[PDB]
Amino acid sequence: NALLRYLLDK
Amino acid sequence: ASIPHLILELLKCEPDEPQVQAKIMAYLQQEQANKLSTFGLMCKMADQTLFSIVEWARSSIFFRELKVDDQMKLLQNCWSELLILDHIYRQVVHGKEGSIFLVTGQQVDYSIIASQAGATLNNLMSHAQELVAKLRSLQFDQREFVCLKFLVLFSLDVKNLENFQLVEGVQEQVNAALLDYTMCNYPQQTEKFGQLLLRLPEIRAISMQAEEYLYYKHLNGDVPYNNLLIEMLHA
Ligand SMILES: C=C(c1ccccc1)[C@@]12CC[C@H](NS(N)(=O)=O)[C@@H]1CC(CCCCCCCCCC(=O)O)=C2c1ccccc1
Secondary structure, three states: OHHHHHHHHO | OOOOHHHHHHHOOOOOHHHHHHHHHHHHHHHHHOOOOHHHHHHHHHHHHHHHHHHHHOOOOOOOOOOHHHHHHHHHHHHHHHHHHHHHHHHHHHOOOOEEEOOOOOEEEHHHHHOOOOHHHHHHHHHHHHHHHHHHHOOOOHHHHHHHHHHHHOOOOOOOOOOHHHHHHHHHHHHHHHHHHHHHHOHHHOOHHHHHHHHHHHHHHHHHHHHHHHHHHHHOOOOOOOHHHHHHHHO
16 A cells, blocks of 8 residues: 555645 | 543644544545555555554553564454444534544534445444444443543453453553543433443444454455555454
8 A cells, every 4th residue: 555655744 | 621641641642633534534645546345445444543543552551562473463352343443432522313424523414424335334334323322311421431542542452462461560550540430420311331341242242343344355356455454453
């Protein structure tokens, strides 16, 4: 789940 | 007054949901203007709700402290349950049985929405509103709502965590705080705390059934492309 990771790191 | 301090810290994490309401309805007003089934509309509303839920989690005390892998695991273990709990608490806050209130704040007759759903989602909505009724009869307030949200996010059943002890401690702290608050502010309703806790497995069962229903409907090509919703579903 790359979208959730980008959301959590952004 | 009569609120433990931990619960105030948890309340500090609640979003200015008037503004969130406005922004979600603006997003949909804009998207629809550029043929969208009711089911797809609900899917996109849930997608925006999921974005807001992620923003709430990464705003949480304790949660920021976690490695991003742990955050991912917790969020993908509890996103469905958080959605169902938010729906139920919305209905409780508005408390007009025979109607459904959406994340947009829009009220729509339960009749006209249920008419458009299959047997699965109709059963799940009936169960959700039975829970709404019971929680209303217990005077479910916002403090207990956020305590339950944190108990659901920081679940004891999520394995393969690095900092499981942090989640255990958060569970202990929030459980004690909710116990204290509920029994001190509602001596009216002893065993209200145990009842609140008994409602969590039921919300969880509803959440899981709904999650798998939307997963299988997506595999069949009936879930319009919702980025984060579908991403949460696949994993
Ligand atoms: C999890 C939800 C959901 C998300 C996407 C699609 C369907 C449901 C929510 C959770 C809240 C969220 N609200 S929202 N739209 O404002 O984000 C969603 C609205 C809501 C009420 C659904 C009624 C629509 C059904 C008509 C077509 C159904 C076609 C069919 O049968 O195949 C949900 C809810 C699901 C279970 C139990 C209790 C409630």
